[PDB]
Design an enzyme around this catalytic site. Structure first.
Site, PDB file in Angstrom:
ATOM      1  N   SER A   1      32.558  34.804  39.747  1.00  0.00           N
ATOM      2  CA  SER A   1      33.034  35.918  38.885  1.00  0.00           C
ATOM      3  C   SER A   1      34.442  35.662  38.319  1.00  0.00           C
ATOM      4  O   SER A   1      34.791  36.352  37.336  1.00  0.00           O
ATOM      5  CB  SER A   1      32.939  37.261  39.574  1.00  0.00           C
ATOM      6  OG  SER A   1      31.578  37.662  39.687  1.00  0.00           O
TER       7      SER A   1
ATOM      8  N   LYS B   1      34.573  35.369  34.680  1.00  0.00           N
ATOM      9  CA  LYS B   1      34.592  36.520  33.774  1.00  0.00           C
ATOM     10  C   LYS B   1      35.873  36.554  32.944  1.00  0.00           C
ATOM     11  O   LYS B   1      35.873  37.126  31.854  1.00  0.00           O
ATOM     12  CB  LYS B   1      34.314  37.822  34.536  1.00  0.00           C
ATOM     13  CG  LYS B   1      32.878  37.927  35.036  1.00  0.00           C
ATOM     14  CD  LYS B   1      32.569  39.169  35.855  1.00  0.00           C
ATOM     15  CE  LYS B   1      31.098  39.285  36.191  1.00  0.00           C
ATOM     16  NZ  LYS B   1      30.651  38.294  37.148  1.00  0.00           N
TER      17      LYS B   1
ATOM     18  N   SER C   1      32.494  43.455  38.601  1.00  0.00           N
ATOM     19  CA  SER C   1      31.950  42.078  38.544  1.00  0.00           C
ATOM     20  C   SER C   1      30.488  42.177  38.163  1.00  0.00           C
ATOM     21  O   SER C   1      29.643  41.653  38.922  1.00  0.00           O
ATOM     22  CB  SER C   1      32.052  41.267  39.837  1.00  0.00           C
ATOM     23  OG  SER C   1      33.374  41.113  40.257  1.00  0.00           O
TER      24      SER C   1
ATOM     25  N   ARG D   1      40.103  38.377  50.984  1.00  0.00           N
ATOM     26  CA  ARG D   1      40.655  37.676  49.795  1.00  0.00           C
ATOM     27  C   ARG D   1      41.996  38.328  49.395  1.00  0.00           C
ATOM     28  O   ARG D   1      43.043  37.611  49.304  1.00  0.00           O
ATOM     29  CB  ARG D   1      39.641  37.710  48.648  1.00  0.00           C
ATOM     30  CG  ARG D   1      38.349  36.953  48.943  1.00  0.00           C
ATOM     31  CD  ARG D   1      37.299  37.262  47.907  1.00  0.00           C
ATOM     32  NE  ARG D   1      36.923  38.681  47.811  1.00  0.00           N
ATOM     33  CZ  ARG D   1      36.086  39.173  46.917  1.00  0.00           C
ATOM     34  NH1 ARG D   1      35.500  38.386  46.038  1.00  0.00           N
ATOM     35  NH2 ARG D   1      35.817  40.455  46.903  1.00  0.00           N
TER      36      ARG D   1
HETATM   37  C1  LIG Z   1      27.735  35.764  41.931  1.00  0.00           C
HETATM   38  C2  LIG Z   1      27.996  37.229  42.122  1.00  0.00           C
HETATM   39  O1  LIG Z   1      27.103  37.738  43.100  1.00  0.00           O
HETATM   40  C3  LIG Z   1      29.448  37.401  42.543  1.00  0.00           C
HETATM   41  C4  LIG Z   1      30.313  36.546  41.656  1.00  0.00           C
HETATM   42  O2  LIG Z   1      29.912  36.360  40.468  1.00  0.00           O
HETATM   43  O3  LIG Z   1      31.384  36.053  42.097  1.00  0.00           O
HETATM   44  C5  LIG Z   1      29.765  38.880  42.387  1.00  0.00           C
HETATM   45  C6  LIG Z   1      29.390  39.695  43.632  1.00  0.00           C
HETATM   46  C7  LIG Z   1      30.681  40.334  44.110  1.00  0.00           C
HETATM   47  S1  LIG Z   1      30.674  42.133  43.835  1.00  0.00           S
HETATM   48  C8  LIG Z   1      30.071  42.706  45.451  1.00  0.00           C
HETATM   49  C9  LIG Z   1      30.275  41.561  46.440  1.00  0.00           C
HETATM   50  N1  LIG Z   1      29.213  41.395  47.410  1.00  0.00           N
HETATM   51  C10 LIG Z   1      28.430  40.316  47.412  1.00  0.00           C
HETATM   52  N2  LIG Z   1      27.574  40.184  48.322  1.00  0.00           N
HETATM   53  C11 LIG Z   1      31.692  39.643  43.275  1.00  0.00           C
HETATM   54  C12 LIG Z   1      33.175  39.594  43.532  1.00  0.00           C
HETATM   55  O4  LIG Z   1      33.642  39.973  44.618  1.00  0.00           O
HETATM   56  O5  LIG Z   1      33.876  39.152  42.625  1.00  0.00           O
HETATM   57  N3  LIG Z   1      31.214  38.978  42.311  1.00  0.00           N
END
Ligand SMILES: C[C@@H](O)[C@@H](C(=O)O)[C@H]1C[C@H](SCCNC=N)C(C(=O)O)=N1
Ligand SMILES: C[C@@H](O)[C@@H](C(=O)O)[C@H]1C[C@H](SCCNC=N)C(C(=O)O)=N1
Ligand SMILES: [Br-]
Ligand SMILES: [Br-]
Lengths: 244, 245
Positions: A49, A52, A97, A229
């Protein structure tokens, strides 16, 4: 004036949380970098993410996203993140996200334009091999924490090869936290599709008289540790007296 | 409910708790409905004082008096009473610390003719800049009510003011006051002390995921001791109305 210093004392924050990873800081005024682990600071991972940020920039600059108010209607497919099963604009899609919104952006941008833009941005290994709508999740793109800082410094200074307007809108969309002491503009990520599973937090801390860029990643075998994080990054920022 | 403005006297409890008098005005953008503890004081016009830094910033950016939010305005070397004013500033820190001397210089470079034209174009308060071009928002003829502050802020929020989109985006960045995972506040404080009655202002808005709540408050401020009450009372009202947790 020495460019990169290792500060192994930050490993105490990883150990306290039974965790492994790297925090990289860049002091913009001094043009000096600091990390607990010079090797892991330069190891490249899927952006997940954190992608993004450039995806937003490219979508805005090409008119795929008109502005931060344009509504992206839920496609009506129930996914396991409740916040994804609703309408979004750029602000809320970044905040939550919302992968499916960004997958649609990527499809409309298309391979040729995505590839050209990531080369112009000098973004990670600049490799979009895989599906145009999932390459940041399980394709060829890789980026290190130090490369995230290099990219973010260009965005902060409006030096990326997109309009000033595109850069201002994405920096607004990155807004995460603010008070009378600091502003954090940042983006989380969780790479799960290829090992090792890692969490990301990349962005910067705006002070009255300086900017501190940061990029952290950490081993994330399950979603249980995702709050680490921000918590580990803040432990380092507080130790360095960057925030109270 | 269809009613433009509704009076909620229960908010007076937050003023009374702090031995204070004033008004909070809220506007629900989605519902196009307003709420206030005092319909009369909501429409009473006062000197804008530092709330004037919002339109002044917009006009300075639009005319190129301010190049961008990074341009440094060097301290003129005159020690003033507010420590934070006795140093270099950019637009962000000048807004944050309400640095009057920087904005007086903007006003001088904008000049009376262009200042007057812009406030007319903005439909800003009574549109009257009579007095010194570099102090009229502190001790001149300009007057604006809490409801008029909301009308002006809604135009800024929607990029509808007659200045560049860029100018509006930069000032909204400069207004950033607070943000977390539940809300964002963009706002500007003011303290009118040069003409009675002395009042404190806080005007701006709360961005939620799915709505925007505009606010404008003013309160009697006989001394600087109570300045913290501008934010504290507004937050008590925002919490009561379930706008913030
Ligand atoms: C690939 C995606 O699933 C992931 C990403 O693109 O980095 C999404 C999912 C979580 S949002 C909720 C976090 N829980 C995930 N199990 C998230 C983040 O924490 O930035 N991004
Ligand atoms: C005094 C005015 O110039 C005033 C204004 O232009 O609105 C300045 C100073 C006060 S905060 C400092 C008040 N006095 C403290 N001793 C202030 C604010 O609260 O925004 N701005
Ligand atoms: Br712009
Ligand atoms: Br912002």
């Amino acid at each position: 004036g020495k460019e990169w210093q290792e500060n192994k004392s930050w490993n105490a924050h990883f150990t306290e949380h039974k965790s492994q990873g790297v925090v990289v800081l860049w002091n913009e005024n001094k043009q000096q970098g600091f990390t607990n682990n010079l090797k892991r600071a330069n190891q490249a991972f899927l952006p997940a993410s954190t992608f993004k940020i450039p995806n937003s920039l490219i979508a805005l600059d090409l008119g795929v996203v008109k502005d931060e108010h344009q509504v992206f209607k839920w496609d009506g497919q129930t996914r396991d993140i409740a916040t994804w099963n609703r309408d979004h604009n750029l602000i809320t899609a970044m905040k939550y996200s919302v992968v499916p919104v960004y997958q649609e952006f990527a499809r409309q941008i298309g391979e040729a334009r995505m590839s050209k833009m990531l080369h112009a941005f000098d973004y990670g290994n600049e490799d979009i091999s895989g599906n145009v709508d999932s390459f940041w999740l399980d394709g060829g793109i890789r980026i290190s924490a130090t490369e995230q800082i290099s990219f973010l410094r260009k965005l902060y200074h409006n030096k990326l090869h997109v309009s000033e307007r595109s850069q201002r809108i994405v920096k607004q969309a990155m807004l995460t936290e603010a008070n009378g002491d600091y502003i954090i503009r940042a983006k989380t990520g969780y790479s799960t599709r290829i090992e090792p599973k890692i969490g990301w937090w990349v962005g910067w801390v705006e002070l009255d008289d300086n900017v501190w860029f940061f990029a952290m990643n950490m081993d994330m075998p399950t979603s249980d540790g995702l709050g680490l994080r921000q918590a580990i990054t803040k432990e380092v920022l507080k130790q360095e007296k960057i925030i109270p």
